[PDB]
DNA sequence: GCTCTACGGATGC
DNA sequence: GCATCCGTAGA
């Protein structure tokens, strides 16, 4: 039955546990943390629990410790040897930040497996797992502590045995879905990479952020002065009611939806919608970036700099990775204040002293992925010759030379292309393009006619989703879309759009995770003596940010060239598609100041 | 009748 | 009285 052996109680017992632990091809590890403080070994993290089959759990107490932790480090760092933990990122970060132990080897996390089996479902707690997947272990839930009495050793042992059972069931479930090698070769190493990113943080100059904040606040005072002058009274710029009054009630064209439609037929008609738009953009910047970042900032003393530590979400409908605490991914790009000041929220994100930011983006990634999946011969030959499809779309749309395509113009062409691929209608295309309804419909017809393989892939993806109830990515991840067969046409169409989008975007996410893993492997081979993160303590790169197809690394100046070569090679060789996977590598003294490193 | 993500402020029942 | 909702930013 449910047993708790205390191996950290005798020399021979602990040594036998270690020598049996090394041989085991798969165990479950759990952390026992009595959190009187909210990162310390023997003060917060109290112990370690290890479970193999037959409802037995071995608890290693980290109280009194040097030799216990040394042998646990030896086994936990390359003892097979698969460690199963609930919330792998949390466990890895806690181990690093408390006792300086890095989980080296193959990891498994029942959370990641449950998300694999049904990514559109809810994040199941471990109890939630036991009730659903392992009902025969339900009597053990009384013993995962409680909100009042935890007993961290007993809670750890119960969680470890439950995680072992749950992952044993989920392993067979994943093999049935043919997602097991993908789980073990792609998904879990990506989890470790993300935890290592979370440990790294991203450098953050408070001085630069304070400078930007002061300029933005002076600009907001000026903007409020103009807005109260362009209207007449001192209304509220943060109230949609106080905006829909003054707007649409004196001379405008319409509650009333005072949204960024004030760009349309209002920005070129009255200057207050532009002033309101600028005020809203700077207010977004302040209240969603600089105020959160100035309160989320944390001083790294070893690096002698401030850093921001985001939390990776990773439980996503499509396999993407987002972040929680500051929401770093959505930090705005540069924009101009006239007083011309350049608000660069990314310019506040800086490397350590003597360091460089290295950012490697995937060139038109989902175009290439879709060209491979659809086998569209036209797109294959076009983008295998180094062409920029976004540039050519922008040129043929505007009639301008492709070489004279602006970066913002390229963004609109990119949005048009991806929207068309992902089920955008004629009305939305007309809005985003300026053309009429019929013109946008004919544009979509021409897009599907010249890229015949793309239309065939769209139809086949929807047909196979109806026939199977799910869609599959390039590397085998499935998403279930029960609305694909809904009688209501809106839910059915929504599921078809999600089917195509999930296929292509999940495949791109899979490629990006693979590239992250392979870059990490090559970096470890090239600089074996470097620290894994900024919390492990500088040679090589450090992976401070992930941008769904872009990997930010923060390398040393001397290692910049080698790191860029490594990153480019790994990103281009992640997957052998019918397309080439070109990566654009940029270097700079800051995230907001990056120059192309032609290499 | 583009998808995905989070998140501040405001509706909104 | 809080709970989502939505518009917003990235991608
Ligand atoms: N559905 C949709 N997906 C988008 C949109 N913008 C970006 N994404 C997805 C598709 C892109 O392939 C992917 C990576 O983002 P990027 O903006 O960097 O674009 P892409 O890689 O296509 O272009 P690039 O050559 O890097 O400029 O993100 C969008 O407007 N709609
Ligand atoms: Mg890209």
XYZ file of C-alpha atoms in Angstrom, chain A residues 51-430:
380
model
C 8.714 7.164 -6.310
C 8.946 4.041 -8.449
C 6.112 1.582 -9.007
C 3.937 -0.258 -6.459
C 2.858 2.815 -4.435
C 6.224 3.255 -2.676
C 7.766 6.709 -2.197
C 11.235 7.511 -0.862
C 11.637 10.850 0.908
C 15.044 12.541 1.134
C 14.978 15.158 3.882
C 17.061 18.270 3.165
C 17.189 19.124 6.885
C 19.380 18.190 9.834
C 22.935 17.467 4.195
C 26.052 18.179 2.154
C 26.495 14.550 1.087
C 22.744 14.003 0.703
C 22.576 16.938 -1.687
C 25.786 15.906 -3.442
C 24.513 12.424 -4.249
C 21.069 13.767 -5.168
C 22.848 16.169 -7.524
C 24.878 13.319 -9.016
C 21.773 11.235 -9.705
C 19.506 14.128 -10.735
C 22.199 15.363 -13.149
C 22.593 12.512 -15.656
C 22.168 9.409 -13.366
C 16.794 6.220 -19.439
C 16.943 8.101 -16.155
C 13.668 9.909 -16.843
C 12.428 12.139 -14.025
C 8.667 12.727 -13.870
C 7.614 15.822 -11.953
C 4.387 17.766 -11.710
C 5.050 21.338 -12.932
C 8.536 20.718 -14.328
C 9.329 24.429 -14.709
C 8.403 25.141 -11.089
C 10.354 22.117 -9.846
C 13.444 22.931 -11.920
C 13.431 26.593 -10.901
C 12.916 25.729 -7.229
C 15.785 23.234 -7.283
C 18.148 25.694 -8.980
C 17.207 28.642 -6.763
C 17.305 26.639 -3.517
C 20.106 24.069 -3.770
C 21.691 24.770 -7.160
C 20.655 21.440 -8.691
C 20.037 21.235 -12.431
C 17.813 18.486 -13.806
C 20.116 17.094 -16.491
C 18.500 14.359 -18.533
C 15.080 13.345 -19.749
C 12.143 14.993 -17.992
C 8.441 14.196 -18.102
C 5.570 16.205 -16.704
C 1.994 14.873 -16.504
C 0.807 18.453 -16.963
C 2.469 18.579 -20.390
C 1.070 15.145 -21.270
C -2.476 16.145 -20.285
C -2.144 19.326 -22.324
C -0.903 17.190 -25.232
C -3.876 14.828 -25.032
C -6.386 17.707 -24.954
C -4.829 21.163 -25.402
C -8.223 22.880 -25.485
C -9.234 21.528 -22.083
C -8.472 23.090 -18.695
C -5.253 22.922 -16.711
C -5.936 19.898 -14.524
C -4.615 19.850 -10.993
C -2.944 16.643 -9.890
C -6.050 15.752 -7.814
C -8.076 16.577 -10.934
C -5.875 14.074 -12.759
C -6.324 11.335 -10.154
C -10.120 11.581 -10.216
C -10.083 11.385 -14.031
C -7.173 9.171 -15.091
C -6.229 7.106 -11.999
C -9.404 6.561 -9.943
C -7.855 3.602 -8.093
C -5.537 6.083 -6.331
C -8.395 8.319 -5.152
C -8.142 7.315 -1.441
C -4.614 8.769 -1.482
C -5.871 12.313 -2.178
C -6.518 12.543 1.558
C -2.840 13.067 2.269
C -1.949 15.800 -0.190
C -2.021 18.045 2.858
C -4.785 20.643 2.879
C -5.212 24.402 3.076
C -4.393 24.167 6.811
C -2.216 21.101 7.541
C 0.201 20.281 4.723
C 2.855 17.994 6.255
C 5.277 18.704 3.386
C 6.957 15.284 3.556
C 3.646 13.401 3.409
C 2.319 15.804 0.778
C 5.484 15.280 -1.272
C 5.293 11.486 -1.035
C 1.608 11.427 -1.972
C 2.205 13.773 -4.896
C 5.126 11.656 -6.107
C 3.203 8.366 -6.059
C 0.220 10.048 -7.707
C 2.431 11.627 -10.382
C 4.023 8.237 -11.070
C 0.609 6.595 -11.511
C -0.846 9.472 -13.545
C 2.124 9.589 -15.908
C 2.081 5.803 -16.276
C -1.502 6.087 -17.522
C -0.810 9.168 -19.669
C 2.170 7.424 -21.297
C -0.071 4.723 -22.716
C -2.581 7.392 -23.688
C 0.134 9.325 -25.561
C 1.427 6.202 -27.300
C -2.152 5.489 -28.391
C -2.317 9.003 -29.878
C 1.220 8.592 -31.324
C 2.503 11.640 -29.425
C 5.054 9.907 -27.199
C 8.343 10.534 -29.009
C 7.230 14.124 -29.604
C 6.563 14.434 -25.863
C 9.996 13.038 -25.007
C 12.109 14.657 -27.745
C 10.468 18.070 -28.246
C 7.946 19.065 -25.589
C 9.854 18.342 -22.388
C 13.290 19.674 -23.467
C 11.428 22.816 -24.517
C 9.962 22.943 -21.003
C 13.475 22.809 -19.547
C 14.602 25.547 -21.938
C 11.670 27.714 -20.822
C 12.444 27.184 -17.138
C 16.035 28.147 -17.893
C 14.786 31.309 -19.620
C 12.630 32.045 -16.564
C 15.729 31.726 -14.395
C 17.687 34.033 -16.696
C 15.205 36.863 -16.739
C 15.875 39.728 -19.105
C 18.054 42.709 -18.289
C 16.227 45.954 -17.651
C 17.720 49.432 -17.349
C 15.656 51.376 -14.821
C 17.391 54.591 -15.897
C 16.313 54.142 -19.513
C 12.805 53.156 -18.430
C 12.623 56.195 -16.142
C 13.749 58.443 -19.007
C 11.134 56.993 -21.361
C 8.513 57.263 -18.611
C 9.273 60.925 -17.935
C 9.074 61.801 -21.627
C 5.849 59.801 -22.036
C 4.276 61.475 -18.997
C 5.179 64.937 -20.267
C 3.664 63.880 -23.589
C 0.488 62.673 -21.858
C 0.139 65.992 -20.045
C 0.502 67.767 -23.393
C -1.955 65.330 -25.001
C -4.526 65.961 -22.269
C -4.019 69.707 -22.694
C -4.672 69.402 -26.440
C -7.641 67.043 -26.057
C -9.283 69.335 -23.513
C -8.526 72.173 -25.951
C -9.716 70.323 -29.066
C -13.057 69.632 -27.335
C -13.613 72.516 -24.917
C -14.084 70.893 -21.508
C -12.026 68.626 -19.241
C -13.600 65.270 -20.049
C -12.218 61.779 -19.375
C -9.834 60.228 -21.908
C -10.031 56.841 -20.149
C -13.851 56.687 -20.323
C -15.493 55.347 -23.476
C -18.655 57.234 -22.492
C -16.812 60.552 -22.128
C -15.174 59.903 -25.521
C -18.365 58.836 -27.315
C -19.492 62.196 -26.054
C -17.422 64.847 -27.884
C -17.000 62.206 -30.595
C -19.961 61.415 -32.884
C -22.043 64.158 -31.208
C -20.596 67.329 -32.765
C -19.367 66.338 -36.241
C -18.255 62.695 -36.662
C -19.443 59.484 -38.314
C -20.272 56.693 -35.775
C -22.817 52.101 -27.756
C -20.709 53.795 -30.442
C -17.542 51.628 -30.229
C -14.898 54.302 -29.672
C -12.145 51.896 -30.704
C -9.273 52.116 -33.165
C -11.860 52.687 -35.927
C -11.076 56.334 -35.091
C -8.115 55.695 -37.367
C -10.706 55.298 -40.138
C -12.394 58.414 -41.574
C -11.831 60.225 -38.256
C -8.046 60.477 -38.024
C -7.921 62.132 -41.498
C -10.939 64.293 -40.567
C -10.375 65.588 -37.013
C -7.161 65.739 -34.940
C -8.692 64.704 -31.604
C -9.097 61.020 -32.642
C -5.384 61.083 -33.430
C -4.668 62.743 -30.085
C -6.873 60.190 -28.318
C -5.117 57.374 -30.190
C -1.688 58.691 -29.173
C -2.848 59.160 -25.576
C -4.224 55.613 -25.519
C -1.036 54.183 -27.021
C 1.212 55.956 -24.509
C -1.161 55.023 -21.669
C -1.011 51.408 -22.815
C 2.777 51.692 -22.802
C 2.899 53.221 -19.315
C 0.245 51.241 -17.434
C 0.943 47.891 -19.130
C 4.734 48.091 -19.495
C 6.604 50.610 -17.387
C 4.466 50.590 -14.240
C 4.372 46.756 -14.241
C 8.082 46.594 -15.109
C 9.138 49.114 -12.457
C 7.287 47.070 -9.828
C 8.284 43.659 -11.232
C 11.954 44.646 -11.523
C 14.466 42.758 -9.400
C 18.101 43.583 -8.689
C 20.583 40.927 -9.785
C 23.665 41.672 -7.631
C 26.104 39.378 -9.425
C 25.244 41.010 -12.752
C 24.936 44.392 -10.972
C 21.799 45.171 -12.940
C 18.030 45.089 -12.770
C 16.222 42.211 -14.467
C 12.631 41.182 -15.169
C 11.562 37.578 -14.553
C 8.435 36.527 -16.489
C 6.458 33.313 -16.014
C 5.903 31.061 -19.033
C 2.320 29.930 -19.648
C 2.844 27.073 -22.143
C -0.675 25.614 -21.719
C -1.923 26.949 -25.025
C -4.517 26.020 -27.632
C -1.879 25.844 -30.371
C 1.424 24.954 -28.683
C 2.667 28.533 -28.382
C 4.365 30.005 -25.308
C 3.160 33.156 -23.555
C 4.215 34.935 -20.378
C 2.354 36.221 -17.352
C 3.975 38.517 -14.809
C 5.090 41.514 -16.931
C 3.780 40.036 -20.212
C 7.148 40.714 -21.817
C 6.228 39.384 -25.273
C 3.739 42.224 -25.820
C 6.260 44.989 -25.083
C 5.609 47.611 -27.789
C 7.976 48.321 -30.643
C 9.387 51.803 -31.186
C 7.085 54.730 -31.897
C 7.679 58.457 -32.265
C 6.656 61.306 -29.958
C 6.702 64.849 -31.286
C 7.394 67.435 -28.593
C 11.377 63.544 -32.285
C 11.602 61.305 -29.232
C 11.554 57.548 -29.821
C 9.609 55.502 -27.284
C 11.529 52.215 -27.352
C 10.231 50.075 -24.508
C 12.597 47.395 -25.833
C 15.570 49.757 -25.470
C 15.152 49.338 -21.712
C 15.949 45.627 -22.115
C 19.707 45.318 -21.959
C 22.417 42.670 -21.572
C 24.933 42.502 -18.767
C 27.980 44.759 -18.911
C 30.158 43.904 -21.880
C 27.273 41.946 -23.368
C 25.234 41.904 -26.558
C 21.634 41.083 -27.411
C 21.345 38.436 -30.135
C 17.909 38.023 -31.722
C 17.340 35.343 -34.369
C 13.934 35.411 -36.079
C 12.402 32.904 -38.510
C 11.916 34.521 -41.908
C 8.225 34.295 -42.903
C 7.970 31.134 -40.856
C 4.370 30.019 -41.255
C 4.483 30.683 -44.991
C 7.328 28.176 -45.222
C 5.567 25.697 -42.920
C 2.347 25.965 -44.936
C 4.275 25.605 -48.197
C 5.777 22.392 -46.845
C 2.498 20.995 -45.477
C 0.510 21.880 -48.607
C 3.467 20.962 -50.861
C 2.497 24.035 -52.875
C 4.963 23.874 -55.759
C 4.599 27.560 -56.636
C 5.256 28.697 -53.068
C 8.055 26.132 -52.736
C 9.953 27.425 -55.767
C 9.197 31.068 -54.921
C 10.513 30.950 -51.362
C 13.339 28.509 -52.098
C 14.863 31.164 -54.360
C 15.216 33.614 -51.498
C 12.124 35.638 -52.384
C 10.156 37.609 -49.794
C 6.500 36.752 -50.369
C 5.353 39.527 -48.020
C 7.380 42.060 -50.003
C 5.955 40.809 -53.302
C 2.387 40.873 -51.958
C 2.951 44.441 -50.772
C 4.433 45.422 -54.139
C 1.690 43.859 -56.272
C -0.910 45.417 -53.963
C 0.624 48.913 -54.052
C 2.212 48.693 -57.512
C 5.525 49.898 -56.045
C 8.929 48.306 -56.542
C 9.451 45.360 -54.148
C 12.794 46.752 -52.965
C 11.118 50.002 -51.846
C 8.671 48.199 -49.526
C 8.498 49.762 -46.071
C 8.621 47.594 -42.963
C 5.155 48.774 -41.928
C 3.838 48.145 -45.442
C 5.314 44.656 -45.172
C 3.422 44.164 -41.896
C 0.090 44.867 -43.596
C 0.947 42.490 -46.453
C 1.946 39.844 -43.902
C -1.344 40.304 -42.049
C -3.329 40.091 -45.295
C -1.553 36.893 -46.347
C -1.938 35.166 -42.978
C -5.551 36.271 -42.599
C -6.405 34.927 -46.050
C -4.689 31.634 -45.241
C -6.557 31.445 -41.920
C -10.101 31.995 -43.169
C -10.502 35.771 -43.325
C -13.622 36.836 -45.189
C -14.113 39.379 -47.937
C -15.452 42.031 -45.546
C -12.485 41.917 -43.160
C -10.088 41.793 -46.114
C -11.776 44.863 -47.561
